[PDB]
Each structure stands twice: as structure tokens, then as C-alpha cells.
Amino acid sequence: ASIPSSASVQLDSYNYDGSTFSGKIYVKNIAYSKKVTVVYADGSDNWNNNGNIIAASFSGPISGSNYEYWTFSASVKGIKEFYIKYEVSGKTYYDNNNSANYQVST
């Protein structure tokens, strides 16, 4: 994925080897204090009231743009799909892959 044009948060890429779920995320540097979480459905596509979460952390700047990189990695029992949540300055933004969410393979 290329840098987003206006979205506040947008997955860049993700990886899954059947045990470890990891990835890189584009985050618009709106304010200093940020919270970026990855919310997923389990091997049984159960969301658990948005309770299966992975906290992402600052990874590094992106020269010449108003975005920066955040990464995440975690072992998960199983996963069917996921979306990203971004909280900053009292507002909440999301990356739900045009409301289809990101579907994971195997």
C-alpha cells in the first residue's frame, strides 16, 4: 500500500504464518498521544465484543509526509478477519477495508 491520501489510519501490510500475526500500519501524525489497536475475529470468526486486541506501537517516521509507521506482532489462537482502530485527540478513526474488514487466509 502507498501512503493514504486522507484516511487517518490505514494498514500498510500484514503477515500471518498460522501462529504469529504481525503488520505495519500507516498513521497520520495528528497529535503526540496516540492509541492504535488491531481488533480481530477468532479462528471461529467470533469478535468477542471487540475484545480480541493487539496494541500497536510507534515504529518510525516517514520522511516528507504527515504519516508515520506503527507496527504490531502477537501470537493468536486463530484469526479470520480484522480491522484497525486509531484514537487521538478525543476522536476515533478506523481502517475496516471498505467495511469488508481484512480477510486472512488459513
Ligand X SMILES: OC[C@H]1O[C@@H]2O[C@H]3[C@H](O)[C@@H](O)[C@@H](O[C@H]4[C@H](O)[C@@H](O)[C@@H](O[C@H]5[C@H](O)[C@@H](O)[C@@H](O[C@H]6[C@H](O)[C@@H](O)[C@@H](O[C@H]7[C@H](O)[C@@H](O)[C@@H](O[C@H]8[C@H](O)[C@@H](O)[C@@H](O[C@H]1[C@H](O)[C@H]2O)O[C@@H]8CO)O[C@@H]7CO)O[C@@H]6CO)O[C@@H]5CO)O[C@@H]4CO)O[C@@H]3CO
> Closer to Zn ion at the Cβ: 2 or 49?
2
Distance, in Å, from the CA atom of 53 to the CA atom of 41, rounded to the nearest integer, reads 9
Tell me whether strands 67-75 and 20-28 are parallel, antiparallel or unpaired. Answer: antiparallel
Minimum separation from the CB atom of position 12 to ligand X (A): 16
| By the rule CB under 5 A, 95 interacts with Zn ion | no
In which residue are the cell numbers 488459513 written?
A: 106
Residues of this chain, 7-46, that bind Zn ion according to CB under 5 A = 12
Specify whether the CB–CB gap between 25 and 97 falls below 8 A.
no
Minimum separation from the CB atom of position 82 to Zn ion (A): 17
Specify whether the CB–CB gap between 27 and 9 falls below 8 A.
yes
Minimum separation from the CB atom of position 95 to ligand X (A): 17
DSSP character for 3?
P
Position closest to Zn ion via CB: 1
> Closer to ligand X at the Cβ: 34 or 39?
34
